[PDB]
Amino acid sequence: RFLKVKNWETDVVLTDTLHLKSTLETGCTEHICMGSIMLPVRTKDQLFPLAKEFLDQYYSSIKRFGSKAHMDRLEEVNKEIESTSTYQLKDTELIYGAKHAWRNASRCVGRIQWSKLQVFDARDCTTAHGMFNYICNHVKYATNKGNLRSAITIFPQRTDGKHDFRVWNSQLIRYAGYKQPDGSTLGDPANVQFTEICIQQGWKAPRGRFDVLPLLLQANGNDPELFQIPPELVLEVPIRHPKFDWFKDLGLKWYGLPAVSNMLLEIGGLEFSACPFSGWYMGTEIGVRDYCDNSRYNILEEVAKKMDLDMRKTSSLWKDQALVEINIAVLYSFQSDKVTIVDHHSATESFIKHMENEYRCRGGCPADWVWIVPPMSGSITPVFHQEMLNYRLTPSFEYQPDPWNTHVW
Amino acid sequence: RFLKVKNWETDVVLTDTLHLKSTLETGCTEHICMGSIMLPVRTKDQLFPLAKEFLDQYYSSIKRFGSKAHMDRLEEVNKEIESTSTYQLKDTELIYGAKHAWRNASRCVGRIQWSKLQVFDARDCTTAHGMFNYICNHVKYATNKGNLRSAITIFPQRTDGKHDFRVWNSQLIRYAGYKQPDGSTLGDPANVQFTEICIQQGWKAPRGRFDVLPLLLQANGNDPELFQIPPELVLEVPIRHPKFDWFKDLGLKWYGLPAVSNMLLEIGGLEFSACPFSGWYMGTEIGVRDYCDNSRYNILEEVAKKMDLDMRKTSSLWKDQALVEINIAVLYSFQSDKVTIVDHHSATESFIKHMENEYRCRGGCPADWVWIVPPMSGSITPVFHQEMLNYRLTPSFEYQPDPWNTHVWKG
Numbered sequence A: 001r002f003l004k005v006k007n008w009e010t011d012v013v014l015t016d017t018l019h020l021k022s023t024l025e026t027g028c029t030e031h032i033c034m035g036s037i038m039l040p041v042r043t044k045d046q047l048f049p050l051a052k053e054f055l056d057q058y059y060s061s062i063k064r065f066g067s068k069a070h071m072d073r074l075e076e077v078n079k080e081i082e083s084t085s086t087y088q089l090k091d092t093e094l095i096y097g098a099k100h101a102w103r104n105a106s107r108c109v110g111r112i113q114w115s116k117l118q119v120f121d122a123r124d125c126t127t128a129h130g131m132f133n134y135i136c137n138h139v140k141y142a143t144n145k146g147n148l149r150s151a152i153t154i155f156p157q158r159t160d161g162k163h164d165f166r167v168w169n170s171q172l173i174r175y176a177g178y179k180q181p182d183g184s185t186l187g188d189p190a191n192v193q194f195t196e197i198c199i200q201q202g203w204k205a206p207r208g209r210f211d212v213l214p215l216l217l218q219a220n221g222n223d224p225e226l227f228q229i230p231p232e233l234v235l236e237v238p239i240r241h242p243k244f245d246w247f248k249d250l251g252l253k254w255y256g257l258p259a260v261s262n263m264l265l266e267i268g269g270l271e272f273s274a275c276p277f278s279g280w281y282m283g284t285e286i287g288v289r290d291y292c293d294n295s296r297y298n299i300l301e302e303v304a305k306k307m308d309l310d311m312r313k314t315s316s317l318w319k320d321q322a323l324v325e326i327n328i329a330v331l332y333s334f335q336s337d338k339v340t341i342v343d344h345h346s347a348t349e350s351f352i353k354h355m356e357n358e359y360r361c362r363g364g365c366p367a368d369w370v371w372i373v374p375p376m377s378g379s380i381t382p383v384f385h386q387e388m389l390n391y392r393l394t395p396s397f398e399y400q401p402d403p404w405n406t407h408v409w
Numbered sequence B: 001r002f003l004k005v006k007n008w009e010t011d012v013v014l015t016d017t018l019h020l021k022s023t024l025e026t027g028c029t030e031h032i033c034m035g036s037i038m039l040p041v042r043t044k045d046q047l048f049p050l051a052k053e054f055l056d057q058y059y060s061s062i063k064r065f066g067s068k069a070h071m072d073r074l075e076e077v078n079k080e081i082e083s084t085s086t087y088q089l090k091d092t093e094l095i096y097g098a099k100h101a102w103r104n105a106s107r108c109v110g111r112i113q114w115s116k117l118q119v120f121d122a123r124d125c126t127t128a129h130g131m132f133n134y135i136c137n138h139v140k141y142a143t144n145k146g147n148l149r150s151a152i153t154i155f156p157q158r159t160d161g162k163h164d165f166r167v168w169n170s171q172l173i174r175y176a177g178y179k180q181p182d183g184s185t186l187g188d189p190a191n192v193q194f195t196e197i198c199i200q201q202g203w204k205a206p207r208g209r210f211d212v213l214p215l216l217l218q219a220n221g222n223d224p225e226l227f228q229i230p231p232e233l234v235l236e237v238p239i240r241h242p243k244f245d246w247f248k249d250l251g252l253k254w255y256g257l258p259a260v261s262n263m264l265l266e267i268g269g270l271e272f273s274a275c276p277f278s279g280w281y282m283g284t285e286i287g288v289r290d291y292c293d294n295s296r297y298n299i300l301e302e303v304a305k306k307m308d309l310d311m312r313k314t315s316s317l318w319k320d321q322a323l324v325e326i327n328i329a330v331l332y333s334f335q336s337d338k339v340t341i342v343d344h345h346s347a348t349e350s351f352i353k354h355m356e357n358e359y360r361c362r363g364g365c366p367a368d369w370v371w372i373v374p375p376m377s378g379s380i381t382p383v384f385h386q387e388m389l390n391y392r393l394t395p396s397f398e399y400q401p402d403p404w405n406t407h408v409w410k411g
C-alpha cells in the first residue's frame, strides 16, 4: 500500500502514497512486466464520475474542498452533463488540467517546470485556417527569439467523435522524408509516410535533407488542409563542432522548437484531441536519437570516418567516441546561437530535485524509468540509480491513432 | 493469451507464449509498474508440485515425457518427499536445472551461452575447508589462464534452514573496501561492510586500493571460516590506454573472473543457497559501473583532469568523454593480456540473436530491459530499441538476504 523507492547512489528513500490515487492501467500484471513496451466516445454515466474526480482535486487544490462553490460547481456540471451529455471547463479548470497533465506525464524528464506552462485557449476555433493562426502564434510565443517558453494550445474537445480536431503532424515542426529510387531514404525516415500524405494532398516537396514539413490541420472533423509555417517563424540551429571545423561540412542543422502535436489531453473525462505543446530540447534527443538512431539520420559512420577512427572493430568503441562528439556539437551550436537547450546531466539532476519536491509535497511522482534515463551515459546521470514507480494519473496526455488511419474523408 | 514485442529499429515483431508458464510474481500490478525496482523452508505440501513441474519439464526436454522412466521418477521422488520431506536430484537433472536457471535469468545479457555451462556438483561437501577446495578448483577451471570458461559450483541444498551452506562473499573475487577516519574510503566502497566482517573474523588487511578479499565460507549452518585464495589463482589485469600513456599511471587494475556467489539457485523446489557461478565480463561492468559510479571507485574527475577537459560546465560533456576513454582502456587491457572480455555492442547484438532464437524455438525469452541495456551508449546498442517482457520462470537464480543479517552465531 505504501511503496518505497530508493536511490542506490545516495541511499535516500522516498515513500509513495500518490500511486494510491492511480486510476488507469499500466499494461503490466502481477505476472508480467511490460515496462519496456512503447504502447502498452464517453457516455453520461462514464463522464460524471470523471468530472467529479477532477473537480474534487481542483477544489481540493484551491483549499475549497467541500465548500459551497465546490458543491455548486459539481451540481452545475452534473446538470450540464445530464442535459448536454458533456460539459465545459472554466478557464481556471482548463489551465489547471493542462498543467497537471504535464505534471503527471511519467515519461517527461522536464517536469520541474510544470507550473510555468502558458496555456492558449483555442476552444473557440472553428476552421483549419483558424488552427493555422493559433499555431503560428504558439510557435512565435514559445520560440521567443531562442529564449523558449513552454506552451500548449488547446483546440475544441471531442463531441460525437465525428467532429474531432486533429493536427496530423507528429510535431509542429519536423523535417521531411522521401524514399529515393536508390532504395535509400532522403531526409527523415521517421516522417517518410507523413511526407507522402502531404504530397498525396498537394504539397510541393523541395526534396531536400531538411525540409520543414507543412501543417496538415483538421478542424471539426472535416478533411485536413495544408499550410506552410512562415519560414521567418521556424528557428533553426546550424550544427558545428567547437573543435572539428570539418563538422559544418556534414551539412547538419536542427530546429529549435520541439512541439509534440499528435497526443490527446484528457481533463475530467473530457478529451482534447488537438493539443499541441512545446518546451525546449534536451541535447541527447537530437544528438543521440534523431542523428544517430539507425532508423533516423543514422550519421555515426560518416562522423566516425571524418574523425578517422578504427571502425574495423566494435571494441575500439568508435561509435561511442563519435556519439559523444556529436552531442557536444549539438549543445554547442544551440548554446552559441543563444537557443534554449538542456544537457542530460543538468536535466536529470533537475528531475531528481523535482522528484524529491514531489514526494514531500504530493506524496509521489509517477515516472517511467525506461524513458527518463537518457539514451547515452545512462549510469553517469543520477536517474539511473533512482528507483521509480510508474502509474497513470489524470489529467493526462495519451497516445491516439494516427488520424490518417481513422479519417473518413 | 499471446503477447507481442516489437523492435522499433527493425520493425520485427515476436510473439510470446512462454509467459503463460510463468508462476512467480513480478512486483507489478495492473495499476503500477515496479520494473525499475532493484529488489521488488518449504513443506511437503508445497514441494510435491514444484518437483513435478520440474521433472515434467525435464522429461519433455529429453523427449521421454510420459515414458516409464518419467513415471517411475515421479513415483520415486514423491515417495522420497513424503518419506524424508525433501528429495535428491539426479546428476542429469541438476545440470539441466542449473543450465535452465541461467537460461531464465532475465537480467543476464550473456545468455546466448546458456547451454555451455560447466556444472560442478559439490553436493558431497560437508565443511568450509571442503568448500574452499571446491571454490579453488572452480576458479582455476573457469580462469583457464585467461581463456575463460563459464561454470557453477553447487553445494548441498537447504534442509531445515538451520544447516545452510553460504558463501558470505558477494563475488568469489572482489577488492576490499576501507572506511577512513577522515570519512574517505580506501579501495572498493561497495565492499566496506563485508571487509569489516572479514577483519573482525581475523583477516589481516593489507589496506591497499586493490586487495583481494579472503573467502568467508559457511558449511552446514556453522560459523563461517576465512580462507585466502591462492594468489597464483587470481588473474588480474593492469589497466592502460592504447593512446594515453599516462593512463597506466592511474594505477588501475581489475580481476579477470566475475563470479557472483551470493544468489540462491532454485530447482524443482529445492533451494541451493551456495551456488557460485562465473562467466566473463562485459566491459561496461568495470569501465562504467565499478570505475565510474559515484559510489564505487569514482575515477571520472581524475581521468578528466589528465585529459585536460573543460570541467567548468557539464554541457561540455567532459564526464561523457572521459567515460568512453576509460571503457576503451578496460577492453584494450584485457584483449592485450588475452583475457576473455566482450564489449557492449558485441554482447547486445548477440543477445538480440539469442532472444530471437528463443522466441522461435521456445515461445519467448523473459528479459529485464532495465538491466539488459548497457549503462553507457544505450540507444546505439540494439537492445534499447527492443521491447521485452519480463517474467519469472523456474529453475531460477534468486536474491537472498545477506548471511550476516540472518546467521545465528554459535561461537
Ligand code: HEM
Pocket (backbone or CB within 6 Å): A101, A102, A105, A107, A108, A109, A110, A111, A113, A117, A150, A151, A152, A260, A277, A278, A279, A280, A281, A282, A285, A342, A347, A371, A397
Ligand atoms: C520545458 C522543457 C521540457 C523538457 C526538457 C522535456 C523533456 C522531455 C523528454 C526528454 C522527453 C522524451 C522525449 C522523447 O524521447 O521523445 C519528454 C517526453 C514527454 N514530455 Fe516533455 N519536456 C519539456 C516540456 C514538456 C511540456 C511543456 C509538456 C506538456 C505540456 C511535456 C510533456 C511530455 C510528454 C507527454 C512526454 C511523452 C511524449 C511521448 O510519449 O512521445 N513536456 N519530455
Ligand code: HEM
Pocket (backbone or CB within 6 Å): B098, B101, B102, B105, B107, B108, B109, B110, B111, B113, B117, B150, B151, B152, B260, B277, B278, B279, B280, B281, B282, B285, B342, B347, B371, B397
Ligand atoms: C558468459 C559470460 C556472461 C556474461 C557476458 C554475462 C553478462 C551479464 C551482465 C552484464 C549482467 C549484469 C551484471 C550487473 O549489472 O551486475 C549479468 C547478470 C546476471 N547473469 Fe550473467 N553473464 C554471463 C554468464 C552468466 C552465468 C554463467 C550465469 C549463471 C549460471 C549468469 C547469471 C546471471 C544472473 C542470475 C544475473 C543477475 C545477477 C544480479 O541480479 O546481480 N550469467 N550477466
Ligand SMILES: C[C@H](O)[C@H](O)C1=Nc2c(nc(N)[nH]c2=O)NC1
Pocket (backbone or CB within 6 Å): A036, A037, A038, A370, A371, A372, B008, B384, B385, B386, B387, B388
Ligand atoms: C522498446 C523501448 O521502449 C524503446 O526503444 C524506448 N524508446 C524511448 C525511451 N526513452 C525515451 N526518452 N524516448 C524513447 O523513444 N526508452 C526506450
Ligand SMILES: C[C@H](O)[C@H](O)C1=Nc2c(nc(N)[nH]c2=O)NC1
Pocket (backbone or CB within 6 Å): A008, A384, A385, A386, A387, A388, B036, B037, B038, B370, B371, B372
Ligand atoms: C534503480 C535501478 O534499477 C538500478 O540503479 C539499476 N541497476 C542496474 C541496472 N542494470 C545492470 N546491468 N546492473 C545494475 O546494477 N539497471 C538499473
Ligand SMILES: NC(=[NH2+])NCCC[C@H](N)C(=O)O
Pocket (backbone or CB within 6 Å): A171, A258, A259, A260, A278, A279, A280, A281, A282, A285, A286, A289, A290
Ligand atoms: N523536449 C521536448 N519538448 N521534446 C519533445 C519530443 C521531441 C523528440 N524527442 C525529438 O527529438 O524531436
Ligand SMILES: NC(=[NH2+])NCCC[C@H](N)C(=O)O
Pocket (backbone or CB within 6 Å): B110, B171, B258, B259, B260, B278, B279, B280, B281, B282, B285, B286, B289, B290
Ligand atoms: N559478466 C558477469 N558474469 N558479471 C557478473 C557480475 C559482475 C559485477 N557487475 C562486477 O562488475 O563485478
Ligand SMILES: [Zn+2]
Pocket (backbone or CB within 6 Å): A028, A029, A032, A033, A034, A035, B028, B032, B033, B034, B035
Ligand atoms: Zn511492470
